[PDB]
Amino acid sequence: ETITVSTPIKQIFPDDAFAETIKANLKKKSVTDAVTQNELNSIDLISAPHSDIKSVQGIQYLPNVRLLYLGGNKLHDISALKELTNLTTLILSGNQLQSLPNGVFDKLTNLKVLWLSVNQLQSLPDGVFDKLTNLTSLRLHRNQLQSLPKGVFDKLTNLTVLRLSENQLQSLPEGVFDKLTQLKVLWLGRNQLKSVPDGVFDRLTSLQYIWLHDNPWDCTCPGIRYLSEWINKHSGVVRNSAGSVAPDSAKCSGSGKPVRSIICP
Amino acid sequence: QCSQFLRGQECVEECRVLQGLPREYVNARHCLPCHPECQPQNGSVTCFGPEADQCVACAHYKDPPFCVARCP
Numbered sequence: 001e002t003i004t005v006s007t008p009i010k011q012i013f014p015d016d017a018f019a020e021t022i023k024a025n026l027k028k029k030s031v032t033d034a035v036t037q038n039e040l041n042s043i044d045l046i047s048a049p050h051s052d053i054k055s056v057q058g059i060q061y062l063p064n065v066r067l068l069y070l071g072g073n074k075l076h077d078i079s080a081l082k083e084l085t086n087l088t089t090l091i092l093s094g095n096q097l098q099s100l101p102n103g104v105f106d107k108l109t110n111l112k113v114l115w116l117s118v119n120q121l122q123s124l125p126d127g128v129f130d131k132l133t134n135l136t137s138l139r140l141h142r143n144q145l146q147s148l149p150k151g152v153f154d155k156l157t158n159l160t161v162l163r164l165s166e167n168q169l170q171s172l173p174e175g176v177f178d179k180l181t182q183l184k185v186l187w188l189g190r191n192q193l194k195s196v197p198d199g200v201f202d203r204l205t206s207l208q209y210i211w212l213h214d215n216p217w218d219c220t221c222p223g224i225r226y227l228s229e230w231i232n233k234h235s236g237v238v239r240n241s242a243g244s245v246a247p248d249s250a251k252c253s254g255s256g257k258p259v260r261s262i263i264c265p
Numbered sequence: 266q267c268s269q270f271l272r273g274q275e276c277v278e279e280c281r282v283l284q285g286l287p288r289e290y291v292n293a294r295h296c297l298p299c300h301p302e303c304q305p306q307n308g309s310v311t312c313f314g315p316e317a318d319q320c321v322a323c324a325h326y327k328d329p330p331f332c333v334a335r336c337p
């Protein structure tokens with residue numbers, strides 16, 4: 001997308017905060033100033049955390065934007081990001097996203113960092129991350145996910161960090177982590193998980209840190225056998241919310257005994 | 266008096282979580298440097314806490330679970 005004639009910032013970016021943002025970025029004197037496409041082409045980095053931005057309408061005119069720090073605003077719509085193909089870092093944490101368009105990230109194939117935390121996401125579309133083959137960090141902390149689509153991470157073979165804590169996850173799909181052989185950091189704490197699929201962690205051969213605390217683990221046998229044996233075999237990998245090694249941090253619901261203390265006949 | 270984040274006594278809008286040196290983590294809205302033995306990362310945070318066993322990767326050697334300056 002291209003503007004053909006000089007146009008006021010205020011007209012390209014109808015959001016008052018975001019227009020102010022573009023003006024400061026281009027060092028203009030006021031949002032009434034007209035801008036060219038070559039000036040918009042010059043924008044590589046937008047950083048506007050906690051800026052009261054309610055829409056990024058107009059951002060589609062920034063073909064070279066590569067780093068987008070938009071955490072802590074009031075966005076509920078991100079449709080205009082769809083063709084920002086040079087994005088490598090997209091921080092949308094702390095906005096008002098309740099859902100994501102199907103295929104919204106499909107053209108953002110250079111994305112490395114995608115942070116969607118502290119929103120109100122109720123679900124993830126099937127295949128929403130499939131085109132992000134270069135993604136290394138995905139954060140979905142503090143949303144309202146109760147389930148995940150089968151295979152939702154399968155294309156993220158380079159993923160290094162995956163944050164799924166403080167959701168409402170009732171269950172993990174079988175095989176959900178099977179392709180993440182480079183994954184080093186996995187948060188699953190503060191969800192509603194009573195169990196995991198047998199073998200769910202067995203392809204995570206680079207894993208260094210995992211959070212499993214504040215889940216209502218069902219410690220009846222034989223269902224708990226895999227998770228108990230895994231923690232015992234990975235006792236230095238489990239971290240508590242404070243960040244310390246704490247294999248006992250994964251607790252049985254009801255009794256509060258450590259999951260790893262359970263022995264099944 | 267700081268509305269967003271503090272680096273020492275300075276009020277800043279962001280910490281050096283994904284770029285800038287030294288790389289940082291945040292605790293109670295304070296920017297704090299990652300342990301110097303964590304290797305700065307491109308595409309992820311560099312640390313999740315202060316300690317030499319909370320790095321994503323070690324800059325030099327690793328004496329599990331700690332990143333260390335000298336060959337163990």
Ligand SMILES: *[C@@H]1O[C@H](CO)[C@@H](O)[C@H](O)[C@H]1NC(C)=O
Pocket residue numbers: 283284285306307308
């Ligand atoms: C990561 O690598 C890219 C491409 O090589 C580079 O442009 C960017 O500055 C780097 N990341 C950091 C924060 O150094």
